[PDB]
Amino acid sequence: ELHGYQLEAVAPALRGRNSIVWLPTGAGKTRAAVHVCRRHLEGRRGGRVAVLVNKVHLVQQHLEKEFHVLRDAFKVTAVSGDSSHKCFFGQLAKGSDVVICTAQILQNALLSGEEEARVELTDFSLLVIDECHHTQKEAVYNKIMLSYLQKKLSGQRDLPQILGLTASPGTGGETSFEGAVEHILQICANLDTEVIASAQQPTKQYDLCQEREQDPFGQRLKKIMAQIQEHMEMPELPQNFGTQVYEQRIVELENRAAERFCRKTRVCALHLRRYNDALLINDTVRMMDAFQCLQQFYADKDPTERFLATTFEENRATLQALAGDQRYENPRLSKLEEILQEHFQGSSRGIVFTKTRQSAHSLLSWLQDTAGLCGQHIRAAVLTGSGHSNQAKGMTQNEQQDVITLFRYGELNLLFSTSVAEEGLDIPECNIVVRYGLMTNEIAMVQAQGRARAQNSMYSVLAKANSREVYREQLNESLVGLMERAIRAVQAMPERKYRLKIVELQRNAVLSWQVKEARSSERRQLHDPDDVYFHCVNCNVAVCRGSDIRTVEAMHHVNINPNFRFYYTVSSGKIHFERTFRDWEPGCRIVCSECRQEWGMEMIYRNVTLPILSIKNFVVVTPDEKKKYKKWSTVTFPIEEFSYLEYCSSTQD
RNA sequence: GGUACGUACCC
RNA sequence: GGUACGUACC
Ligand SMILES: Nc1ncnc2c1ncn2[C@@H]1O[C@H](COP(=O)(O)OP(=O)(O)O)[C@@H](O)[C@H]1O
Ligand code: ALF
Ligand SMILES: [Mg+2]
Ligand SMILES: [Zn+2]
């Protein structure tokens, strides 16, 4: 059953050594890990395995395709975010021999204050960490492993054996041999690795496209942007319309205008960001997709707003007409059409990877409206993860699974997917991967290519000629080789030198964490919460103090002041999510009573309703400065945990 | 919707 | 120090 190379790769794990199994994409690391799990559980009494993954869909895949075979002798349980609300994790885990979950499910249990929810690392004898190259920086995998290292270095006994699985440790952005080796050693230190274990036809093509000869739609948007910038009456405004740098600079101006309460500048900047978004969409997909971006924004008075509405209305019909003209088609789409026409003339089974969820939806719509493809028997669908925004909702575990199951045997034969499916997904019949204008690291490149499991697969890079994306793809190909050299060098290192380096790196990691925690705490304690005032980002009115805020589940920032209700208005009916939570559900959206700016949403927490505030909708004012924050975790005053008991007691008075 | 982190980009 | 996107958790 197991191939020779699978047996070879797991020999250290079978002996109890912490290891990383480094085998190519599609080589069968999962089955190898199942064998380790079986022998681990057979080889002692009372063992318990946790299998950690990084994407929701991989929980069911690993269970149904691989780990379920253990149920002839052992209890195997799977948990994701979608199923979380039903059982206490600690109960479920402790009743199982093997638990399979996304890593943050385990992390939440490790951090829990509730006896029934909580688990310790010492409740497991083996941790299998899939896609273990993510065990870096402040990713969840590394939060879990840093706690392991803190416990190890303090002398804790009974920590689990570690089995990491990866095709691609990467080079961590390093382009030198010295740097790449250091990166490999860092990953080994993070995972407490004793040995990196390894073993002892697809074609790649660059499908390059040219810039559009004529782009009257884009040209008109740039003309409008210039008009809006003239209206702002400001020198030194950015001119580089239709770029990520422009986006950054205009949002930075928007944030500065919020902090200084310059309403006209802030609103103009907010609109300019939408025109820039439209230019980026126009470059990626169809003109009409870009038009719909702007039309939706203006469909959803003040002199600045009147100017901006009029400006759009004056150009709307010309823009829509241009967007219907085939003469100005996006060459990226012309190229994609050529690829699909060549390869889907039922035979093929493909994934086209795009950056954004909205792009994936737009590509499906394009496909469905393209005469030249209607006739090739293409049955396509979008696959995204559970990310969400106003631009684009996500997909639930169940929705993702439906698409995946139909794609597996060809009920669907083409997916437009985000990076949700770049790693781990196993579709043996997938024989084509197109990467549509992506800028990624070498890991994502190797992984996404690897979704084409079939013999005689093809991998297409569809990107603009002479672009940074093409340069980065070429560089990344070289970095894969560099990575391989570096891993072999680490594998060949004298044991004494390796062990000493690992020691050094683990020590550095645990010391560096302490210093970071101290710095974060110092920042958090700078101001008394009574001295911090929140202002509406839109109208600048004061609305509460820092002392009014509490956290729920260390995430949701509620205002507990009984008179805050006079400052916000309930602005919708009840919100519904797909996922249900243990102690609360959403109520309605809330907005500033003075200007209708979105602020957050109600939480119905047991028998009370509390308003949750989104940090991005405020300017935070302290005695020292006024600042727009993107994250609650960096504010300069302390916030206490919500106490439901204390809250109910104080309200009864 | 809320939160965090990763990747890309700029400083 | 920021921007965008993505995923994950809630
Ligand atoms: N020894 C084997 N014989 C036949 N098929 C195998 C063997 N080991 C694994 N497989 C299959 O190989 C495919 C790729 O395995 P997977 O574990 O997803 O690869 P990866 O190493 O990227 O995790 C799966 O369909 C799996 O069932
Ligand atoms: F390396 Al894989 F699925 F784990 F392609
Ligand atoms: Mg895998
Ligand atoms: Zn307001």
User: Ligand 2 centre from A423 Cα, in Å?
Assistant: 6
Q: What angle do CA A160, A23, A414 make, to 5 degrees?
A: 110
* DSSP notation for A537-560: TTT--EEEEGGGEEEETTTEEEE-
**Contact criterion met (CB below 8 Å) for A76 and A97:** yes
CA distances from A203 to A233, A347, A456, A596 (A): 54, 17, 7, 55
Q: Which residue is nearest to nucleotide B4 (CA to C1')?
A: A555
* A253-A620-A559 Cα angle (round to 5): 135
**Topology agreement, domain A1-200+466-526 and domain A201-212+329-465:** yes
Torsion of CA A568, A571, A576, A579, to 10 degrees: -30
Q: Which residue bears the tokens 């025109």?
A: A275
Q: Which two tokens stand for residue A210?
A: 């040219």
- Residue A175 CA to residue A39 CA, distance in Å, equals 40
| Cα A385 from chain centroid (whole Å) | 8
Packing angle between helix A357-368 and helix A287-299, nearest 10 degrees?
Answer: 120
- The domain spans of chain A are 1-200+466-526, 201-212+329-465, 213-328, 527-653
- What whole-number distance in Å separates Cα of residue A306 and Cα of residue A314? 12
Nucleotide nearest to A108 (CA to C1'): C9
* Binding-site sequence positions of A for Zn(2+): 536, 539, 592, 595
Which of A165, A142, A174 has its CA nearest to residue A509? Answer: A142
Q: How far is the CA of A225 from the C1' of B10 (A)?
A: 21
Q: Are A273 and A247 in contact (CB under 8 A)?
A: yes
Contact (CB, 8 A) for A639 and A622: no
Q: How many Cβ atoms are within 10 Å of A155's Cβ, its own excluded?
A: 6
Task: Write the CA distances from A212 to A4, A318, A362, A478, integer angstroms.
Answer: 52, 19, 19, 30
Does residue A84 contact residue A125 with C-beta atoms inside 8 Å? no
Three-class DSSP category at A329: coil
Instruction: Choose which residue among A29, A427, A453 to substitute to test ligand 2 binding: the one with the highest number of ligand atoms within 8 A of its C-beta.
Output: A29
Listing DSSP states for A582-603 in one string gives SSEEEEEEEEETTT--EEEEEE
Nearest to A488 by CA among A218, A199, A248, A79: A199
Q: Which nucleotide is nearest to A249 (CA to C1')?
A: C3
Fold of the CATH domain A213-328 = phosphoenolpyruvate carboxylase, domain 3 (1.20.1320)
Give the Å distance between the CA of A178 and the centre of ligand 4. 54
Q: Label residue A606 left, alpha or beta by phi (over 0 means left) and psi (-120 to 50 means alpha).
A: left
Q: What is the resolution of this structure in A?
A: 1.5
**Pocket of ligand 2, beta carbon within 6 A:** A 25-26, 29, 167, 424, 426, 450
> Which residue lies with its CA nearest to atom 1 of ligand 2?
A25
Ligand nearest, relative to CA of residue A542: 4
CA A269 – ligand 4 centroid, Å = 18
CATH of range A1-200+466-526; options 3.40.190.10, 3.90.79.10, 3.40.50.300, 2.30.300.10: 3.40.50.300
Strand order in the sheet with A640-641: A568-574, A584-592, A598-605, A608-613, A556-559, A549-552, A640-641
By the 8 A CB rule, do A209 and A332 touch?
yes
CATH level 3 topology of A201-212+329-465: Rossmann fold (3.40.50)
Sign of CA dihedral A521, A523, A524, A527: positive
Pairing outcome for strands A618-621 and A568-574: unpaired
Among A473, A22, A419, A423, residue whose Cα is nearest residue A204 = A473
Distance A82 CA to ligand 2 centre (A): 23
Helical pair A303-323 and A263-284, crossing angle rounded to 10 deg:
10
Tokens 């293409």 found at:
A378
Residue A203 alpha carbon to ligand 3 centre in Å: 21
Task: List bases in chain B with any atom under 7 Å of a protein Cβ.
Answer: 1-10
Binding-site residue positions of A: 1, 6, 26, 28-31, 66, 426, 453, 536, 539, 592, 595
Estimate in Å the CA A255 to C1' C5 gap, whole number: 19
Helix (H, G, I), strand (E, B) or coil at A39: helix
Edge-to-edge, what's the strand order for the sheet holding A380-383? Answer: A203-209, A458-464, A432-436, A350-353, A414-417, A380-383
Within 7 Å of a protein beta carbon, the nucleotides of strand C are 1-10
The residues facing A640 across adjacent strands are A550
Q: What angle do CA A21, A104, A73 make, to 5 degrees?
A: 60
Q: Specify whether the CB–CB gap between A460 and A433 falls below 8 A.
A: yes
Which of A131, A419, A433, A449 maximizes ligand 2 atoms within 8 Å of its Cβ, making it the mutation to test the pocket?
A: A131
Q: Which ligand is nearest to the CA of A618?
A: 4
Q: Which two tokens stand for residue A527?
A: 């101001």
For residue A104 the two structure tokens come to 């943050």
Measured over the CA atoms of residue A209, residue A214, residue A217 and residue A221, the dihedral's sign is positive
Pair A225, A312: CB distance under 8 Å: no
User: Residue A615 and residue A504: Cα distance in Å, rounded?
Assistant: 39
The phi, psi pair for A386, rounded to 5°, reads -90, 10
CA A102 to mean position of chain CA atoms: 13
Tell me the C-alpha distance between A252 and A240, whole Å. 15
Any residues with Cβ below 6 Å from ligand 1, and which? A 1-3, 6, 23, 25-31, 65, 167, 426, 428
DSSP characters over A269-286 = HHHHHHHHHHHHHHHHS-
| Ligand index nearest the alpha carbon of residue A619 | 4
Q: How far is the CA of A420 from the C1' of C7 (A)?
A: 7
Task: For residue A263, give the ligand nearest its CA.
Answer: 4
* A345/B4 CA-to-C1' distance in Å: 45
Dist. CA A25 → ligand 1 center (Å): 9
